[PDB]
Amino acid sequence: NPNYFVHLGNLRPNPGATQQRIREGRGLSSRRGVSCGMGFKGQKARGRSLHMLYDGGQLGLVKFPVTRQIPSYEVLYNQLGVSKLVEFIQLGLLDHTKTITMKELLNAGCVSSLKYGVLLYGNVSLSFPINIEVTACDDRARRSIEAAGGKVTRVYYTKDGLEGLLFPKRFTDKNLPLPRPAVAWHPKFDGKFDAVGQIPPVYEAV
Amino acid sequence: TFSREQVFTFAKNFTGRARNVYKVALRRVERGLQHSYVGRKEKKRTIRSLWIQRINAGCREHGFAYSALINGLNQENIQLNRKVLSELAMHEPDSFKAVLDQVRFMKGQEIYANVEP
Amino acid sequence: PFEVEYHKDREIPVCNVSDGSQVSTTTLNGKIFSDKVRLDILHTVVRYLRAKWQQGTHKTKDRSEVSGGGRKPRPQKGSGRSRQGSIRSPIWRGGGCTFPKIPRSHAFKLPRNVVRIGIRSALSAKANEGRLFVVDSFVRGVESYDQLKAGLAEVTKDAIGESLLLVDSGECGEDYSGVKLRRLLPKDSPRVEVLSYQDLTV
RNA sequence: UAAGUCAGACGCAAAGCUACAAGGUUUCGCGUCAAAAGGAAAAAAGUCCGCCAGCGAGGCUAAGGUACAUAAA
RNA sequence: AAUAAAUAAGUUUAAUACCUUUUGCAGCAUGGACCAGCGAUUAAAUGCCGGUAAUUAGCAAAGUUAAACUAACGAAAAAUA
RNA sequence: UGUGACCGUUAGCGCAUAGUACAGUAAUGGAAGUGCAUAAACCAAAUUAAAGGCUUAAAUUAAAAAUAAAAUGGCUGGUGCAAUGGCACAAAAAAUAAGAAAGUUUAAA
Ligand SMILES: [K+]
Ligand SMILES: [K+]
Ligand SMILES: [Mg+2]
Ligand SMILES: [Mg+2]
Ligand SMILES: [Mg+2]
Ligand SMILES: [Mg+2]
Ligand SMILES: [Mg+2]
Ligand SMILES: [Mg+2]
Ligand SMILES: [Mg+2]
Ligand SMILES: [Mg+2]
Ligand SMILES: [Mg+2]
Ligand SMILES: [Mg+2]
Ligand SMILES: [Mg+2]
Ligand SMILES: [Mg+2]
Ligand SMILES: [Mg+2]
């Protein structure tokens, strides 16, 4: 066989990809020769006795107060920036000539995994109108879109309704009717939603 | 730690159980090798002492002293060392005496490349 | 040691098993058959495959699994002997193992992309060594094992090796020709193997 | 290094305690040992000189020595 | 501590075992009569920090899971016209 | 029955058959032990070395073969090699469940 043939008997790994394990207790001139590098006596050198976090008895970490404030439920939403929405449209992954819904965002790749809804935030300088329906929005995003002539609508969906919006084929392939939309939201959420979402959204021209 | 073959090679001339018993021979082998490191260092000190004694004995037979000779050689720019000087006194008495006479009296005839300038 | 054109397509003749004669010519994609050969990737995939195949049905017994050994065999003090707690201790002849073996799996994971790089390196290596051959079919016109051997010998006469590997489109391919090839191939053949393209490995 | 260590000792020089005692005890400045082979003082952990990668039958010195033991007036 | 370094082979000089434990052990501190065999940081899951690669990862097979990214002050004027 | 980067007589099951021999009033505990061959510790035997004068000119050889101390006698059973013995799961089969309570169900031609 020539020198450049490759077979099972001349394979090696890339240098630096592996290193030999240290086997302690194997001689005076070996690494960690006799006492295995643990010292001479004490609690640390007698096996699994001492937790690494014990501080000797002072217990300094539990001398601090406790806070019980509950964070807002909106930390469970997926956050979408206005600047990221525009980039997708410019590249051509989103159609800006029709109403944009969360289904389009999911398929385009703007949002990864939705369980509750999408929150739209940020500032952006636009030159063309955009019509987008989301579950939540801040004021900076609303001003940016409306400045160019767009419309931002906050839509209320339930657990079953959100499934129909995102995966309608999951129901038609099984010959099942689509979920029905909600009637109204609890008054405690007044000022959070503008309209009740329709499972098949009504697309319009922009 | 030395192996059985190494231990018994070193201990082939030892006495009693030190020859063929591993535990006994191993400790005897290591102690001996420690003696050898010290032995080589001391050898260089002892031999130089012996050279000086022989030179001093030769000097005093003629009425001189070792310390006077060493000083005298450095004034003449003669760089013979003690190993050579020791051997001259024992085996070449006539040449050893000639060196002493030059240092003490400086009555040697100088040699030039051109005998007749 | 010679000049190689990387990423360039290759033109390869097609031979016939029945008579060992050239029949046509085809083309090989340059990204698969003219790629760089990664020696370190081949090493990783080979280790990956060997680890997966290891069976790992092995076990031993520790001091708690060996028979007996419950009672304390000697008094703690007074006898002049060493203190002992059980006869099945690791220090005792016939005792348990300090760290027993257990049935276990040895397989680890690799990305699917790294496996692809290995396959391309292996296919590219064969072409650069002149050990890659293409045939129209394996069973058309051949009715005996000896006939197939002679044809393969004629096709691969210009090579250094001895053993051969045959790849087809699976049993249910080429009008179920694979079934005939399996029947013809003798049992316990140490120098010839037949695989489908789905089971090809580095 | 998310490692080991939290038993230290003595010499010269000061102070508290003891009796301006202890190879005592408590602090403090420098050094040595601990973890340091080699040379001088008798043996010589802590004093004086001085820091051993290896070999050699070359040379010059330190502390200390120069009628015998024992190298050199 | 039964050796070492040398030698004219007569001899001369150097030289208080090892381990463990200690401020300090030739130790009048601890363990070993000798030989052969056996006898002690191993495996799984998860986390942190280096190294070496892939250039998102897993399924599925034009569609879905996991991760990652996502507004901060639109501030430069370099024209031998 | 099938497979093994599982073991190969201090290993692997306690057992290359033995829950036997043996210990104990009893419950109970629980061994050793394959075949072949200059291994070690261990006990006896083994010290040394001498040598001083035939007169020289026409052989031999089918062919081949044939002159030299690495190792005393023992006791013991390590090491090396092999398997009619073990270990782990897999396949097939087996085992197993009913609501009701002296009452009807589940049958492929
Ligand atoms: K450590
Ligand atoms: K013995
Ligand atoms: Mg301590
Ligand atoms: Mg400690
Ligand atoms: Mg066992
Ligand atoms: Mg303390
Ligand atoms: Mg303290
Ligand atoms: Mg004191
Ligand atoms: Mg210490
Ligand atoms: Mg001088
Ligand atoms: Mg003198
Ligand atoms: Mg003490
Ligand atoms: Mg004892
Ligand atoms: Mg055996
Ligand atoms: Mg057994």
Q: What's the 3-state SS for chain A?
A: CCCCCCCCCCCCCCCCCCCCCCCCCCCCCCCCCCCCCCCCCCCCCCCCCCCCCCCCCCCHHHCCCCCCCCCCHHHHCEEEEHHHHHHHHHHCCCCCCECECHHHHHHHCCCCCCCCCEEEECCCCCCCCCEEEECEECHHHHHHHHHHCCEEEEEECCHHHHHHHHCCHHHHCCCCCCCCCCCCCCHHHCCCCCEECCCCCCCCEC
CA distance linking residue A120 with residue A133, whole number of Å: 10
Residue B85 burial (C-beta neighbours within 10 Å; 0-12, 13-18, 19+): buried
**DSSP 8-state assignment for residue C71:** S
In sequence order, which ranges of C34-144 are alpha helices (DSSP H)?
A: 39-53, 112-128
Residue B25 burial (C-beta neighbours within 10 Å; 0-12, 13-18, 19+): buried
Residue C154 token pair: 């004629």
CB-based contacts of A191: which residues, under 8 Å, 6+ apart?
none
CA distance linking residue C107 with residue C116, whole number of Å: 19
**DSSP 8-state assignment for residue B103:** H
Whether residue C115 contacts residue C46, with contact meaning beta carbons closer than 8 Å, is answered with no
In sequence order, which ranges of chain C are alpha helices (DSSP H)?
A: 30-33, 39-53, 112-128, 145-155, 177-184
Which of C115-133 are b and which e, b meaning 16 or more Cβ less than 10 Å from the residue's Cβ? bebbbbbbbbbebbbebbb
Three-class secondary structure of residue C192 per DSSP: strand
Three-class secondary structure of residue C169 per DSSP: coil
Among C114, C119, C113, smallest CA distance to C201 is for C119
CA distance linking residue C114 with residue C126, whole number of Å: 19
| Nearest amino-acid residue to E40, taking CA and C1' | C98
CB pairs under 8 A between A and C: 24
CA distance linking residue C52 with residue A186, whole number of Å: 57
How far, in Å, from the CA of C80 to the mean position of ligand 13?
A: 12
Q: Is the CB of B107 under 7 A from strand E?
A: no
CA closest to A18 among chain C residues: C44
Residue A13 token pair: 């790994």
- For the beta carbon of residue A82, count every other beta carbon within 10 angstroms: 24
CA closest to A14 among chain C residues: C40
Which of A3, A4, A11 is the closest to C42 by Cβ? Answer: A11
Whether residue A130 contacts residue A145, with contact meaning beta carbons closer than 8 Å, is answered with yes
β-partners of residue A133 are A153
Residues of chain A (29-58) having a beta carbon less than 7 angstroms from strand E: 34, 36, 38, 40-41, 45, 47
Residue B11 token pair: 């201990």
What number of residues does chain C have?
Answer: 202
CB-based contacts of A192: which residues, under 8 Å, 6+ apart?
A136, A154, A185
Distance C21 CA to F96 C1' (A): 67
Residue C19 token pair: 């008579």
Q: Which strand E bases fall within 7 angstroms of a protein CB?
A: 1-6, 13-15, 17-18, 20-22, 34-44, 51-59, 64-72, 74
Whether residue C31 contacts residue C5, with contact meaning beta carbons closer than 8 Å, is answered with no
Three-class secondary structure of residue C172 per DSSP: coil
Distance from the A14 Cα atom to the nearest Cα atom in chain C, whole angstroms: 5
Residues of chain C (20-59) having a beta carbon less than 7 angstroms from strand F: 50-51, 53-59
Residue A78 token pair: 């997926």
Radius of gyration of chain A (CA): 30
Cβ–Cβ gap C44/A1 under 8 Å: no
Residues of chain C (69-108) having a beta carbon less than 7 angstroms from strand F: 69-71, 87, 93-95, 97, 101, 103, 106
Neighbouring subunits of C (3+ Cβ pairs under 8 A): A
Backbone angles phi, psi at C194, to 5 degrees: -125, 125
Among C161, C152, C149, C153, smallest CA distance to C186 is for C149
Whether residue B8 contacts residue B23, with contact meaning beta carbons closer than 8 Å, is answered with no
Residue C182 token pair: 């399996």
Q: Apex CA A132: angle with CA A128 and CA A134, to 5°?
A: 150
CA distance linking residue C64 with residue C83, whole number of Å: 19
Chain center to CA of B84: 9
CA distance linking residue C156 with residue B22, whole number of Å: 63
Q: Which strand D bases fall within 7 angstroms of a protein CB?
A: 3-6, 55-60, 71-73
CA closest to C161 among chain A residues: A1
CA closest to C160 among chain A residues: A1
Q: Fill in the amino acid letter for A116.
A: Y
CB-based contacts of C117: which residues, under 8 Å, 6+ apart?
C38, C41
CA distance linking residue A125 with residue A140, whole number of Å: 11
Residue C17 token pair: 């098993």
β-partners of residue C28 are C10
**Which segments of C64-202 are extended strands (E)?**
134-135, 164-168, 192-196
Residue A74 token pair: 């909106």
Handedness of CA C169, C173, C174, C180 (dihedral sign): positive
Three-class secondary structure of residue C51 per DSSP: helix
Which of C1, C43, C129 is the closest to A12 by Cβ? Answer: C43
Residue B58 token pair: 């030769």
- How was this structure obtained? cryo-EM
CA distance linking residue C144 with residue C139, whole number of Å: 9
Find chain A residues with C-beta within 8 A of C44's C-beta.
13
Which H helix or E strand runs over B59? helix B22-61
CA distance linking residue A29 with residue C118, whole number of Å: 42
First to last CA, chain C: 24
Report C:19-58 residues touching A (Cβ under 8 A): 37, 39-40, 42-44, 46
Radius of gyration of chain B (CA): 25
